[PDB]
Ligand binder design. Sequence first.
Ligand code: B12
Ligand code: SF4
Ligand code: SF4
Length: 379
Amino acid sequence: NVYQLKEELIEYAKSIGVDKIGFTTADTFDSLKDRLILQESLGYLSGFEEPDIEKRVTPKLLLPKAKSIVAIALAYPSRMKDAPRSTRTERRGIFCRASWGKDYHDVLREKLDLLEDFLKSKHDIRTKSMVDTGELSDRAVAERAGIGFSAKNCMITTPEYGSYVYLAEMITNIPFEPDVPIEDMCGSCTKCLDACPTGALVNPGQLNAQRCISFLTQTKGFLPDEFRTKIGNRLYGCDTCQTVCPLNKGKDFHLHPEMEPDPEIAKPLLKPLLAISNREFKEKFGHVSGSWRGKKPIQRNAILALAHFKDASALPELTELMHKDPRPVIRGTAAWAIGKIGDPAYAEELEKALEKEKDEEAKLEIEKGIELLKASGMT
RNA sequence: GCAGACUAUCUGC
Ligand code: B12
Ligand code: SF4
Ligand code: SF4
């Protein structure tokens, strides 16, 4: 009966393109609770987590008289067909794989809405669904439901699809039989830990999110200097601890057409981003997950990417931004970039902007830019 | 009306 409904749910889930489905109880996540507290006391959380720990670990608080949680996963593509080439004059930035195609929040919610209506259409079933923006830890739910195991890079990693999956889940009042957690396949490997550009993976399965490039790309303020050279040409997110992972070798699934990257926005030219209108940003980037904080972090990161490529051809546009952009973070990061690119011809204009800039943080960035030129010109 | 900022409000033309 419940066994029967489970069988049907699984069947239906697959038919609407869910790539993996699991079941667990609505029992409290005791281990997670301790973990969240530890991470918090260490200053290792990101701040994107639901702040109420009671709600994060207690399904029955979220859904009264809850009995189970249904976990779903969808595999997303890891290779971009016909990626454009980033040339000396036409430099590009890159969005992480989790921001290719239609925002996964929309895709996975659509599927959960269907799973919910499936159950409602039967019987007194009650549900509460979430993807990423709900109170639960999606990874904790998926681990306990047998979707994948918790690898050393913190990713839920599946045998079929690797770590390249979007997670979502649905709390119900249906006493489904739970599944069994699956085996840890990392063994003695430490490739992700050694590859991480900032050492954010401080121990296996432990992230200092404050040092993680994926977090850093999404911040709205000034990027701390020690990361300005580690971010490379990343505009949003970071994939290094997954792409380097042996468990992901060969894993390039194209099962969902709306997840297919549009190469011109997944790997966009940097210079046009510096001047994009809001209307144009909304039209081009508005349906990818990477636009959820608007265009400012993206534009800040594109400035850093151009400094990274030392693109002297961006120096006039950067000079205009340093002067004209209404945002202190953009004027300041542009001034730093001008100094970083290392064309002594712009030293004078930095000196002149310093005397005109009123914002103290931006003034400081112009001073750093001036300093960068002074040091590099004397080499 | 347009453009911008901030995450409805604010600011210009
Ligand atoms: C905040 C946030 C982040 C933060 C912090 C990530 C992190 N590792 O904590 C930042 C902004 C850095 C980030 C980055 C990314 N994230 Co993110 N993020 C989230 C969010 C909203 C909550 C994460 C969270 O609560 N972390 C806190 C830690 C403490 O818990 P947890 O990871 O959720 O759960 C595990 C640990 O607690 C661990 N644990 C528990 N007890 C113990 C005990 C011991 C001893 C140990 C060692 C471990 C351990 O086991 C749990 C289950 O795996 C979730 C969505 C959600 N609501 O859950 C997405 C989510 C984790 N992110 C996701 C993605 C795709 C990413 C990126 C790959 C995006 C990118 N390409 O840049 C990177 C990967 C970074 C990484 N190596 O982990 C997916 C992961 C899917 C998957 N297959 O695992 C999620 C689930 C979103 C989704 N629904 O698809 N993210
Ligand atoms: S996402 Fe990038 S910065 Fe963050 S842990 Fe993985 S490799 Fe390190
Ligand atoms: S790189 Fe190695 S240790 Fe890290 S998640 Fe992959 S298999 Fe596990």
